[PDB]
Amino acid sequence: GTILIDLSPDDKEFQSVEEEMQSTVREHRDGGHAGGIFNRYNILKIQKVCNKKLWERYTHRRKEVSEENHNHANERMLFHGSPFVNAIIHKGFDERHAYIGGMFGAGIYFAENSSKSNQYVYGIGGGTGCPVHKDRSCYICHRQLLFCRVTLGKSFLQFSAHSPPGHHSVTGRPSVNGLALAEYVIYRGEQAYPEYLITYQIMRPE
Ligand SMILES: Cc1cc(NCCc2ccc(O)cc2)c2nncn2n1
Ligand SMILES: [Zn+2]
């Protein structure tokens, strides 16, 4: 049921998505170990992801959350990086898209920083890097991220499975690295919708 529609670089929608992508790159404490060394991306394609069934599943859950949270879904747009992107955009997020060993427990993790999600496209910790060159910093091979609609509802704040009782998600608030943005976790696949598929390369800095 999934269809991918390409946005053209002349569309303001393409342009706003690229800017969210470029504007939220930061340096990582691993010096680039997981995701590579880069300050910006070369965006090759932005596709909108259309799947009526996944969308209806997402909106259904969004409404239940909103009614449980003073009519506020607390919907954000956040990045997600995974070797399972192809499964996600055809079948939706599910338990098999859970980072079993994440900091906030087995769930589905998202980030405000595109460069954080970029660390996961090739696996936990960057795995062994691109399949062609086994290079976590590969400037050649094409990568893909999702920019997703995520329902947070009442989110539990954590300064640094199930949500804590009373809550629909966990917000991981950056607590030492002053430049980091927030990271979020949800525990039900229906609370996210993989709205844009972004194909890109990291760029070698000058
Ligand atoms: C911790 C984390 C994991 C992310 N993705 C994990 C994808 C994944 C990779 C391998 C695996 O066995 C399960 C999930 C992620 N994306 N954007 C931000 N994050 N943050
Ligand atoms: Zn490569």
Curated annotation (Swiss-Prot):
Ranges where the PARP catalytic domain occurs: 8-206
Top-level taxon: Eukaryota
Binding site for Zn(2+): C130, H133, C138, C141
Post-translational modification: Ubiquitinated at 'Lys-48' and 'Lys-63' by RNF146 when auto-poly-ADP-ribosylated; this leads to degradation. Deubiquitinated by USP25; leading to stabilization.
Tissues in which the protein is found: Highly expressed in placenta, skeletal muscle, liver, brain, kidney, heart, thymus, spinal cord, lung, peripheral blood leukocytes, pancreas, lymph nodes, spleen, prostate, testis, ovary, small intestine, colon, mammary gland, breast and breast carcinoma, and in common-type meningioma. Highly expressed in fetal liver, heart and brain.
Cellular compartments annotated: Cytoplasm; Golgi apparatus membrane; Nucleus; Chromosome, Telomere
Family: Belongs to the ARTD/PARP family.
Reported function: Poly-ADP-ribosyltransferase involved in various processes such as Wnt signaling pathway, telomere length and vesicle trafficking. Acts as an activator of the Wnt signaling pathway by mediating poly-ADP-ribosylation of AXIN1 and AXIN2, 2 key components of the beta-catenin destruction complex: poly-ADP-ribosylated target proteins are recognized by RNF146, which mediates their ubiquitination and subsequent degradation. Also mediates poly-ADP-ribosylation of BLZF1 and CASC3, followed by recruitment of RNF146 and subsequent ubiquitination.
Quaternary structure and partners: Oligomerizes and associates with TNKS. Interacts with the cytoplasmic domain of LNPEP/Otase in SLC2A4/GLUT4-vesicles. Binds to the N-terminus of Grb14 and TRF1 with its ankyrin repeat region. Interacts with HIF1AN. Interacts with RNF146; this interaction leads to ubiquitination and proteasomal degradation. Interacts with NUMA1.
Name this protein carries in UniProt: Poly [ADP-ribose] polymerase tankyrase-2
Species of provenance: Homo sapiens (Human)
